[PDB]
Each structure stands twice: as C-alpha cells, then as structure tokens.
RNA sequence: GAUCGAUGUGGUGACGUCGUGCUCUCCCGGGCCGGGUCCGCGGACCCCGGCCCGACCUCGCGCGGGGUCCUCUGACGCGGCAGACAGCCCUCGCUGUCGCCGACUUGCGGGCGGCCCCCCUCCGCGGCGGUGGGGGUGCCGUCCCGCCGGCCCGUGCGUCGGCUCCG
C-alpha cells in the first residue's frame, strides 16, 4: 500500500465570516480621497472602454478619470447649482439639471450646452435618457414629468400626477418609453407604454429617495427611509421583500455588473451588499462620512462613494500529443507535509518540534492539536514530551496557556497537561519561569471551572423555561 | 529525432525523438506505412533501442529515473522506476548486449552498472577513474569497453568485474563515442578533434599504447556517433555540432 | 503494483456535525442605559456594545433590561450567544447578563412569544461546553498538589616573568 | 563503533578467501581516532579519554583473567595533596593549581544520615603557571606554609601566610638550577627539610628555614635499569627516606647520617605506592600486581605478618583487580589497622584478624580485609583524624558533560 | 581539523541532548539532565529588535 | 521487490464486529476485512473482489495499542447509501465515536463522503438499520445506543445559493424508561419500528413518531429481533437471553406462541416466510426452519457444525429452485450461508497479440 | 565497578514541487485603549475584549515632516545557472543574468487542445450514467514565426555599407 497522512480535524464555527463573497469584496486596495467643494449629489460612470466618472457638486460638474486626482474636465457655467449628471449609453453626451428648470445636453468634449429645454418652471433634479439614445425624460419640482426629443428640440409629452417634489427618475434599457419616476409624495408611478396616463402605481411608506430597475425579470427596487422594498411586475404591485438593515435613511441604491449583487448606500456611514436570490445581507462596508452617492465601474473594478462633505472616496482593485498517438499517463508525485514526513520515519520528537513552531501555533493551531492527538493515538506522547529542558517545555506551556480554554481543543490538551505534570514534577523548584507558567495555567483552570458552574446554573433555568411550554 | 533503429528480424523501423511519441513503421521504399504510435506524458526520449531478440522496446528520458519497457508480444508497458540496490538519480545513457543477457547503465563518479535483461535486477558495479563518456559491449558479449573523460579507455570482464587492460587513445583529450564490429576485428574510438582511430581488437587487449590502423582526419568537429555495418565493410561517422558532418568509411581499405 | 484496496474520496465538501451546532441534535437617573443598548443593537458597532454590555453591577443590568424595549430582546439574545464563546474573563459577565435577563424581566414574558428554537441553539451550545468538568477537576487537583510541592578564589595569582 | 574484519574461506574445499565484517563493539561514546592490533587483542583509543583493550577469544591460547576486557579512564598516580593540620586540599591540573579548605559540621547522626554543615567548602587559592609547559608534580607542606611544584624547565616554591583571614604568597628569590625538572616533591613532617627527586637519577635534600634555602646533600643515582618513575616516602620521625623506580629495588636512606641504610629485595612488578608506619617505622609497598609487602626499616627484613600473608597468599578476588593501589595511609593511634584505596574500592586491613582463604568471600554487597565500595569512583582518600576521613571522588557523567560534541544517533523509542 | 569534524554540514548534537535520550525511554520519565539553561535567562531585549517584522505576519 | 499478484479468498480478522451483508449492486458478500477496511468478496468463486477503506489512517502493529475499530455498517436505498460506524475506546470514561455517510457516484463508480458526524451518541452504538421500503418519500436511518437514546436521521436538502447539495439532518430523538436500546428493526412497509429496551420491546409508528404498543414478556433481555415477511408480515419474532423464542401478533397485540429454544443466529428470508434459527447445543449447532404462523418446525437439521456459528445470512438466488416437499421448500427461494467462530463459511447443498505476425515470430 | 565466547539493542520503498530540505539553529513577541483580578486607595498581573508595530538617513520645529530602500532567523545542502567542442560528476563559482546607478527577465499577437453552466437524441440489468447535438461571458495550458542572429565600418541610421550565419 502507501503511507497515509495524519487526519486534520476541522471544527465548524457558528459565524460565516469567511465567505467567497468576502474574498471578492475585500480584494480592493486602500481608499483614496479627493477633495471637493459642496455636497456630492451623484457620481455616474460611462460605459465606454475609457471608463471615467462625472461627479456633480454645487454648481460644478467635474469629469474625473481613473486615478487622476485633478478633474480631467469641468463644466462650471451653471448659474446656481447643477443636478443629476448622467451619461448616455455611447458615452458621448450627458444630461444635466439646474435649479432654474432648464434641461441641458452637454458634449463630453465641449464647453457650452448643445440643447437647452425651458419647459419647467422650478428646479429640476432628475433627468435620464431612454432605450433609444435620442429622447430624454426629466422631472422637476413643479410636480410634473416631461418627455423631450433631442433632434426636434421640443417637448414630446407632459405628465402631471404627483403631489410633492419629484426628484428620482429611472428608465428601462430594454423597452423605450417605459420609465419610472419617484417623488416625496410617498408614491412611485410608472409612466409608460404609449398612453397619456400611468398604468401602474406603487405606495411607499416614506418619501422615496431612490428607485432602480433590474434589467431582467421586471423587478423594481425602491428606497424610503430605512426601508428598501422590492416590487414585481409579473403581477402588478407585488411587494416581494421589504428589508431594513440601516439605522438611518437609505440614500442611494445601485446594481452591480452581476445581477446577483445589489449595493445599498445610506446616511449612516454604511453600505450593505445583498444577494438578490436570497435577499439577505452578504457584505458590509464602513466609511468616514454619510454616503450620498454610490457608483460602480465595469465588473466591480472601481467603487466611488460621494459623501455629505466635499471629499469622496475611490476604491480600486513542451510538445503536445498528436491525435493519432496513444496516450500514456505518468503518475504525479504527491508532496507530503514536513510533519507527515517525520511521522513516516518515526521522528516523533521532531514532528512535535515542528508543530510547536510559533507560526504554526498562531496561524493553524488545529494542525498542532491534530498532531498531539495522533501522538496520543500512537501512545508515544510521553516519549516526545519528556527529555526537554526549561526552554523547550516553556513554549509548550505557553501554547497550553493560550489554547487550553478553547472548547474544541480541551480534551487532548488537558491530557497533555496531565502528562507533562506527571513527568516534570521533580524538577519544578529550580526554574522560576516554569513556576510562573504553571501558575497562569492554574488560574485559567479555576476561572474556566467557575465559568462552567455558572453555565450549569443557567442550564437549569433554561431547562425550566423550556419545560414550561 | 533522438534515435532510429531497424528491427533485427522484421522490416520494422522505430523512430523516437524529443517529442514524447515513439513510433513503429513498416519498412517499405515507397510509403512506409505506420504500424503504431505511443505518446508518453512527460517523457522526452533521450534514447530508444530494440532488445537483442527484438521482442521488447526500451526507452529512457532526459533527467528521469524511470525506465520504460514495452513488451510487444504480451502487450504490456512496464515502467521500471525503482531498481533495487541502485543509487543513481537519473537514467539516460545505457547499452544492450548483442546476446541479450545483459544491460549496462552509465552512471556518475565513473560507475558502470550491470543489470540482468530478463529481470532488470542489478548484478554488480564497475568504477573507473574519471567520468564515463561512452561504453559498448564486445561482439562475444564477454567484455566491456569503457572510454573515460581523460582520453583513456578501460576493458572490463563481464563475468568477473575486473579490469583486464588499460590502453590510451592517441591524441585524445577526451573521448565521446566508441564502437565495435560484429566479427570482432575492429574497435573504433571517437575524440574531440574529430579524429576516429581504428584498432585491431587484439592490439587493445595486450598493448598499453596501441597504434591505430588508420586515423580518420576527414571530420573536423567532435565525433558523437559511431556505427558499424553488419557485414563489416562500412563505418559511419557523424558530428552533430556542424551541418553535413557525416561520412562513410570503407573498412578493409 | 497489484493491491486490491479501493479508496473512497474524502474531500472538503462533506458536512461535519459536532454536538455544538444545530444539526447534531433534535425622575432622572443613570440607573439604566436602554437607548444606548438599542442603538448598539441596531448597528453592530463593537465599541458601544462593549461599553453597554461589559459591566458587572447587577442592578444596572436589572434596570437596563426592565427599561428596555420589548421587541429587541432577541437581538440581545443573539449578541450574548455570540459573545459567550471566549475566554472566561469576558464570558462570566455575559453569563451574569444572561442570568439577569432570564431571571427577573422575562421569567413570565418569554413563555409568550413561543420562540423556543432561538434559545435552543444556546441550550445545545451550553450543554456541549459543560462536558469537560470532571477532567478539569482532576487537572485542578493535580495542579494543587503540584503547587503544594512548589512551596571562586579570594586571591587569584598570576606569576610574573623573572 | 569498532569493527572487526576477518579473512574467511568461502567453502572448506576451496582455497579462495573473502573479507567479511564479523564483530562490532561499542565501548566509546565519542570519536575513535586510533586503533591498534595486538597479536591477541584489539586496542582502541578515542577522544572520550578511554583506553580499551579487548582480547579476541579465538586467538587466546589459555582462558584466564588475561582474556578479560580492560578499560582505563582514571590516572594511575595521585594528583591530590593534603594538609591535615589546617584542613587543606591541593589539586593539580595541567597549567594551574587549586587550593581548598574543608568545611566542618556540628550535627550528629547514626548509620546513613546526612549531617547539616556549619561552614561550607571554601576555595582559597588559584595559581596559574607561565608558559605552555605542563606541571609535572606538586606538593603541600604538612604545616601548610610551603607550596612546591615543578615543570620541565623551572621549579617554583612559595611561602604563603594566612593572615587577617587572607592568603599571601611570596616566591623565593632564587632556586638552584639542578631542581629544574623534579619527578617527585616530598615534604617532611616538619617544614625544615625538603626532598626532591630529579628527572635523571639524583636525590636532593634542601634546608628550609625562615624563607632561606640550603642544598644539604645530593644522593647519587641508584644503580640499575630505570623501570618506572620514582616514588618518595618520608618517615614521620624524619629519620628515613624511601625511594623506588629502579630494577635494584626500593632503597632506604638515613637522612641524619646522609648515607644509604638498606635496600628492599627487588620485585619484578613495578611499585605503585609506598608508605611508612608512624611508630613501628614499617614500609608498606604496593605493586602493579595486587600483592603487597611490609618491611621493617630497623630490622632490615620482612615482617612476620608479611611473611604469613606471602606464604598463605592473597585471595583470588583481590588479585583479579584492574586498578592499582594509589594511596596508603596510617594512623598513630591504631598500629594494627592500615588503610589503602584503589579507584573502585577502599580497604582497611587488620593484621591481628585471621587471613581469608579462597573458600571464604572477600566482599559482601573474622575477616582481615574490610573492603568497601560505597564511593565508587575514588581519586583520593585520607585519614583526616582518628574519626575523620576525606574522600575526593569524580563521577563519570561529570567528565562526560565536559567533552566535545558527539555524532547524532537515531534511537528507536524516540 | 576543526571544520572537518565540527564545521557546518556535520551531524553533531549537544552533550546535554545526547545524554537526555536515555531519560525519554526510562520506566519513570525524567526531564533533561541539565534542566536550567543560562543563555535563556540572560537575554531579554535583543530578541525584540531583530524579529519585529515576523510577528506582524503571524497575527 | 514489488507486488505482482495476490492470491486470497476470505480475509481472516480477529473479530467480525459487523454482520454478513450483501451489496445490492454487485451481489457480493460484504464484511470486515483488513483493519479499517470492509472486504467485498465474490460468493460464486472463492476470490476476493476488493477492500474498501473507511478510515484512511496509518495502522501500526505495535502491541498494547488501542486501535480504531469499524463496528457497524449498513446499505440504504438499494446500494446508493452506505453508513459506517467507527469507535476508539482507550478508557471506559471517554469514547470516540464517528459515523459516516457515503453516496455512490456512478460517474466515478466509487463512494464519496457526504456527511460526517463525530460523537453521534455518548455511548457505543448497538444497532444500525435502513428503511428498504421504497414507498417512504425520504430515506431514513435509525441509530440506537447504550446511552438510552435512539436517534432518527433523515436526508434533507442542503442547497444554498453558492452550491447545490444534499445532506443528513437529525429528525427525531426517542427514549423509554432510561433503558439501554439493544436492537431496532423496521417493518416490511416501514410504517412501524420495533425497538428493544433490554427485556421489553416497544412498537412505534414511524410516520408520526408516536408510540403504538409495548410488549413485556417476563422472560429475559432480547438478543434478536425481527419482523415477519410476505404472508407472515403481521407477525413479529423475538428471542430472549433465557432461551425463549416468542411470536407476537401486531393485529391482536398479543403473543401467539412461545418456545424453549436458545438461538444465537436468527435470519429472516427476504423472499419467503421461512425463518431459520441456529441453536447452540452442547454437542454442536442445530438448524430449525419454520414459519411464524405455525408453531411446529418445517425442517430440522442437527450436527451442521461442531463449532459455534457466529453469523448467518440469506442470499436471493437468481434462478429459483423447485422442491415440492414442504421440508425442502425453503431452499427454493434463497441460499443460506453461515460463518462460524473459526471464520469458515458454510452453506447447504442438495447436490490481442498481432505482433507475433508483425515481428516475424512465425518466421 | 567491569569482567574470561564477548556482536552498535531494535522504526517503514518508489515516478521532475527544475525553489526547495526526515539537516542544525534564531525568537517565543512589543507599544494602546475597554475591562477584570491579586497584592500591599496605591501598584502588579490577565482577557478567541478590541487596537496598532519594517530598517535607514536627512531637513525643519528631543518632536514632527520628507525621502532611500523596502520579499526577511541565519548557515549548510539540494535544484538551477554560469563557465570546457565535454561536466546530473568539476569549481575558493553565482543563487535572476548583466552592464557601470541603469537595460533585461516583456509586449501584443496568431493557433491548437482540456475540462466544465444548461436544454434536445441513442444505448444501458436502465436508482442514474455514458453516447450523440447544441447553446454558457468559459475559463485555461501548451507551439512556433515573432522583432533571423553574429562581427567590422560609416553616419538612430546607413538602396543595393561588407564578411558571415540563419532561413
């Protein structure tokens, strides 16, 4: 036959902190901070291969590139302030807004707006393109939402069905003229199809800050206060999941490149990452200030968060067989761990020395515990433990002090403590350090026993309250 | 192409090369049809040869311990990875006796290892002073000719591992190849300068400084390959360091 | 080599069931800090959760749980369940907290929500942890025995050349 | 490990022979750098300071004690000098001398009991030589005021005073050149006379008075072939001096008359130790073989007890002992008892008790030789007082501790 | 002569260790022959400086 | 120095903890083989098929060492599921007990570990059985132990969004009067479970896990417990330590008959109503073939073996035999095998190279 | 003590990880907060309580800033590399290889294969697979021409700059 490596005992942990999502969501480097004046209302990426992002703040819309602390471009000819800079699907034109009410089309290489729309009477805060790249949908604070044509330079259509400030609009990439709008009047109405009235309406319990469309399945996600609600369009107005994991208002809601991941930023310096399949939290992000804007690049390459204050955070990441020949496979050599090689040649003391290496004890105590268990199984633990001076036994005592209290490692380490106590009794008086280590182990023993007695009392009480029901 | 050889009893030619395949071909002047081709995983063939009986094929690789034996009659491919009593790390250079009862492996520290052909178990070891450059078996298979790295050639007895004689090749700083004729009349040694010395076999056995019959100066770069005609009328010499460096020698003249 | 032994595959995708996991079995005063505690439970911030929880004064815990909102005791139960797995130094205070909450405030209350599976996990964890008592007692006895056992030339002369 | 290789025939009928390894031996724990092949034995010497003689059973003609394994570790000569009056011990090393004073105890016990002490053993003097040469011999005066020691080139004598609880050393200004290489240095019971044996045959008598030296007389080389190093014994009255080391035998000289007194009949085995009785003036002599002689200086003949022992013969267990007698002691209060010791045993012998024979048992883990082995490794023992003894002993493991590192070996259980 | 028999590449142990193998196989187990180590107690500060970086990776 | 061939029949082991089983896929005898392995052995020809390794740990033949022992094994739904039980007993205070589930992957053609439970019980497991009903919607496994508990495990979906998988989870825990559970058995339908608590036998409904009946004959502790099959499925058979074999009728909830017979091996025929009992007399073992309905023997044989018979098994024969006489009819449905103390297995019998031309070996 | 027939008491193979050892050693940590203990309010010690912590100079004001480097316990082998027309074997060699700090260890390509994410056939002593087809954003490994090389001039170049190689 062949030699068999020692079994490494695995102990399950209640927490699920170690996750593949955790690895995929923590790969990123250190955040970089960019200073700005005024609150960052939103940040929008462009889908073209030169991925850049537009940050709107106060009266200035800045275009930043990857890295590039200074803006690569700036639009500053806004009379008081700008709102909702958004890119087109071709990355060549951008829609903007202002407190005057004129909707402005800008070229990403120019200085003055190409087209101005003057229909609105008060401040406008949401503007977006359609599925076709030649119409725009805009919503302002005068309780109305308007559809405009870009080449014709005139308003196509107007809707007036809202009772408060209208400040969040979204459109569908799949279907033109199918768009969804959001206001502070607690309602979200879907002005769509080819009709002069809303086909569907949705009621939210708080003012609606953000709405987003999942491209596949007809799922609409809306944020109001702490609540984030998911509504299905297969059957009208069907609230699938309502979730709250923030202790303040949820400001912004973004979708990852993969459909399964959903990111929600809020006002309490925390961003939650959820899986859409389970609708449960899978990751958390913590920031220095409240997240007003959250933006994602192609794949999940760059994360951009814009705060209440000016600064915003950017987070980057020989010969081969011919067909007619007959194939013969050679065996691949299997590599044994060093302790396995020692145990194969019966170097029990050397194996115990290897597993007592401080790097091994810190990173993987389970390997050391498994090797002690194997030595106990072979019945040669006493031989390996005996015959050592004060220095060698002191490290074993340190490991026992650090690891005896652990419930997973308790029996075998208790047995090892028994063995070392039996062997090293006559030589105790010489060394003070071993005395100190034994005293520490002793004290940990009494405190663990007191802990377990308290546990027994609580066990009896829980037995009562269980048997009541 | 590392090795090419004709089958002793059938019109079969075997071609092996740095590509891991070993192939056997029907020897026809027009087409040369393929019989079978076998590809090993990570085994670039350093040398492949037929057995003396011709029933099995033996192959070895560059810096590989395992020796592959392919028994055609039984259809079994036996990889000989472990040879008991052998301390050699890698096996690349080896020779087979004409009678088929012995196999010789060139080792390190000037060691020659003799193995039984049928069971692949070590018989004994012979140590020479200096490196082993090349080795060959006698026509009667009763003696071993080994050329050292300082230009000296040793003669060993197969049955009792004793050094019969030690002679010196003329004007050789170090040898690269050695060959013997089937009839037992000629012994040929190649050296670094491209000079091939041809001796009578009786001269090598009894003289410490033999005088070659004729020294071939036609080749100018170090001779690596020596092959005798079965009728002992043609000697083929070659050097791999230059292009077009192959010659043919008429033995009696 | 001809060996007539077949080996099934044992990989890391297999489920392990240890006894500790569910699948194995089955007036102005500072007298209380309730709103701090609920703010800590809303957002899992380690700092102020320690500050509210890492205390010893028994009547402080009593008044904290009495003044506590009634719909957030279950988050307290999860946090105590998480924090009981550790060195006894921090864990004894958490056991005191669990005794205080289970004893006076919710002795009658906890029977009403009928949510026994939530506390069942803690039940099994406690039963699993209390297993090594006699071995610890033997070790303590031998340790007490061990502790009982615990208690040149005046003139150097070098010759000079002469 | 020591390996034996033998030439053996392959078969009985064939004359061909082959070399095979037959016997491994493990008598050393460190490097074995030199071996020799006697006609009947193998000799091995290693850096673990052990000399091993292993006779071969197939090559010995007769089976007796000569075929036994022999191991030599301890020296065959005394290296410790004792001053009884001041409780002083002097130890001799390769390049320096050490002087200690013993510690007394006040407790009283019965049978085997450890008595707590009052004052501990105290290390007084540590004197180092100059140059690469090693010390050949050293000696302390019985009074404790004189220290003498010799090298191959120079002879050093020191007067030391124990004043204000402090040791003070003063070197004598000049010494004669003929004392440059002393084989043996001996002090009389009084500090007046010093006896020196030269490397070449010569004896020197030196008057020591008030830090002043005078070379009284030089005894001529003894006639005969030199067989072993000289040994010097001084009688407690100071009248007689006994010297050995030649084939002629032990010569006894009268110090006061400054002429030869008598010559003990020669014994072929070399002399290992000599001592002189306090009042009877009897010289006891031990040889390399375990036989012992007693000779009367005034009578100039063997004693009656010595004749009785030699006629009866020593016990065969006494004879079959590897280690030689290194020191013999007397006490003035008890004339019948004589003390002597070896490396692994010490004997007190009573002349009045009947002699043992082969039928009786010599030692049990009336009987003349009361011999004990409680102190297993013995380097020195002396009768400090009429109930007081001093025994200087050296365990083997301590010697092993101060040794060069050995080669790592893999053990089964570990 | 020193490097040939005691230099790097040789297989040497300590006299304390070589005598301690017997204690590991006795019917009653004992500790090392020379339990106390002088070199351990004397050194307390040099260890911190050189290995400052190592402990970071382990944690 | 390498192995080229192995000649071996039935592996000889010091102790055979498991019973004699049959693998449904290969129709081969499965029992204890090499330490830590189960031997699969062909019955038709005296050749060992192979050894299957359950605990993949090194084995040392040093004397006076406690070794992990494979005690119980079981095959579930056909041959798809295999349950293995291993334990180490170094001291009476502490026991290591581990239970493993293996699912047969037909693409690999081998077993793969699905679920591993360490310390399923606090004491030694005494019984292990599956529900071979095929009318139960989920596979079920029952483990009984000396601690006084019997635990019921079911196969449940363990799929997540990350991966799709299935696993075994605990379903039920049962106990009666703080008594050690010795034997457990399933009915032919799987609707009821019979579990023995020392002297008494309890009948539970497997569907709702409610106790249905309790039989306590004051004779002795139950050694062997089985259910009837086919037309005798309404009957239940129980053997006591004090040499009493008693048949209970579940419908009447009373015993039909009892008999003074001390049996060590009792095996029910899967394809027949016959029950074969091996009684250990002083002179030798004796075989009794009977039916639960009738209290008289159908066939009696004496002197089957001078040595004690420790296990027995019935194997379904592929082609049924034809014996008209009622004494010989039990041999028709299935073949009977029994293994004695000396590990001897006894039964009842009424009776290319084309190169040869390519290489010119033909000349 | 040893001891004259003496015998080291005794542990487990194998196939290119062409960056690694059955080798010997270095250390067993530090600076902070939240606590908790003990000792005689003070101190001291503990916490699957949380925090941080590279060397090296320099400037300015021991403090702080800036830079330089930043792969880390040291040896010893092993493997590789570099040197003979030859070396797994040889060397006071080098442990990327070289200029004299820098270049370099790429880059884009082309081509093949291997496996999987799902739906439609055909065979299975058919529990479930293979065998065919498809679609999945599907990811990968290897192979060569790459941008033939080597010298000598002239002025990055040198319309047929030369001699050689490669092809």
UniProtKB/Swiss-Prot annotation, chain A:
CDD domains: WD40 (cd00200). The modification N-acetylalanine is found at residue 1. GO terms for cellular component: cytoplasm; endoplasmic reticulum; fibrillar center; nucleolus; nucleoplasm; small-subunit processome. WD repeats lie at residues 35-74, 77-116, 119-158, 161-201, 203-241, 245-284, 286-317. One of its GO terms (molecular function) is RNA binding. InterPro entries: U3_snoRNA-assocProt_15_C, WD40/YVTN_repeat-like_dom_sf, WD40_repeat_CS, WD40_repeat_dom_sf, WD40_rpt. It is found in: Nucleus, Nucleolus. PROSITE patterns: WD_REPEATS_1, WD_REPEATS_2, WD_REPEATS_REGION. Keywords: Acetylation, Isopeptide bond, Nucleus, Repeat, Ribosome biogenesis, rRNA processing, Transcription, Transcription regulation, Ubl conjugation, WD repeat. It comes from the Eukaryota. GO terms for biological process: positive regulation of rRNA processing; positive regulation of transcription by RNA polymerase I; ribosomal small subunit biogenesis; rRNA processing. The keyword rRNA processing applies. There is a cross-link at residue 248 (Glycyl lysine isopeptide (Lys-Gly) (interchain with G-Cter in SUMO2)). Part of the small subunit (SSU) processome, composed of more than 70 proteins and the RNA chaperone small nucleolar RNA (snoRNA) U3. May be a component of the proposed t-UTP subcomplex of the ribosomal small subunit (SSU) processome containing at least UTP4, WDR43, HEATR1, UTP15, WDR75. Interacts directly with UTP4 and WDR43. This is U3 small nucleolar RNA-associated protein 15 homolog. It comes from Homo sapiens (Human).
Curated annotation (Swiss-Prot), chain D:
May be phosphorylated during mitosis; may control the association of this protein with WRD43 and UTP15. WD repeats lie at residues 18-59, 60-119, 120-169, 170-217, 218-258, 259-308, 309-365, 366-394. There is a cross-link at residue 63 (Glycyl lysine isopeptide (Lys-Gly) (interchain with G-Cter in SUMO2)). The keyword Phosphoprotein applies. GO terms for cellular component: 90S preribosome; chromosome; fibrillar center; nucleolus; nucleoplasm; small-subunit processome; t-UTP complex. One of its GO terms (molecular function) is RNA binding. GO terms for biological process: maturation of SSU-rRNA; maturation of SSU-rRNA from tricistronic rRNA transcript (SSU-rRNA, 5.8S rRNA, LSU-rRNA); regulation of DNA-templated transcription; ribosomal small subunit biogenesis. Ribosome biogenesis factor. Involved in nucleolar processing of pre-18S ribosomal RNA. Part of the small subunit (SSU) processome, first precursor of the small eukaryotic ribosomal subunit. During the assembly of the SSU processome in the nucleolus, many ribosome biogenesis factors, an RNA chaperone and ribosomal proteins associate with the nascent pre-rRNA and work in concert to generate RNA folding, modifications, rearrangements and cleavage as well as targeted d Involved in SSU pre-rRNA processing at sites A', A0, 1 and 2b. This is U3 small nucleolar RNA-associated protein 4 homolog. It comes from Homo sapiens. The chain holds residues 259 to 686 of 686 of the full protein.
Curated annotation (Swiss-Prot), chain E:
Part of the small subunit (SSU) processome, composed of more than 70 proteins and the RNA chaperone small nucleolar RNA (snoRNA) U3. It comes from Homo sapiens. Expressed in numerous tissues. Particularly prevalent in the adrenal gland, thyroid gland, heart and skeletal muscle. The keyword Lyase does not apply. The keyword Ubl conjugation applies. GO terms for molecular function: RNA binding. Keywords: Coiled coil, Isopeptide bond, Nucleus, Phosphoprotein, Ribosome biogenesis, Ubl conjugation. Belongs to the UTP16 family. This is U3 small nucleolar RNA-associated protein NOL7. GO terms for biological process: maturation of SSU-rRNA; ribosomal small subunit biogenesis. The chain holds residues 194 to 252 of 257 of the full protein.
UniProtKB/Swiss-Prot annotation, chain F:
WD repeats lie at residues 4-42, 56-103, 110-154, 167-205, 209-249, 254-291. The modification Phosphoserine is found at residue 344. There is a cross-link at residue 107 (Glycyl lysine isopeptide (Lys-Gly) (interchain with G-Cter in SUMO2)). It is found in: Nucleus, Nucleolus. The modification N6-acetyllysine is found at residue 146. Component of the proposed t-UTP subcomplex of the ribosomal small subunit (SSU) processome. SSU processome is composed of more than 70 proteins and the RNA chaperone small nucleolar RNA (snoRNA) U3. Ribosome biogenesis factor. Part of the small subunit (SSU) processome, first precursor of the small eukaryotic ribosomal subunit. During the assembly of the SSU processome in the nucleolus, many ribosome biogenesis factors, an RNA chaperone and ribosomal proteins associate with the nascent pre-rRNA and work in concert to generate RNA folding, modifications, rearrangements and cleavage as well as targeted degradation of pre-ribosomal RNA by the RNA exosome. Involved in nucleolar processing of pre-18S ribosomal RNA. Required for optimal pre-ribosomal RNA transcription by RNA polymerase I. This is WD repeat-containing protein 75. It comes from Homo sapiens (Human). The gene is WDR75.
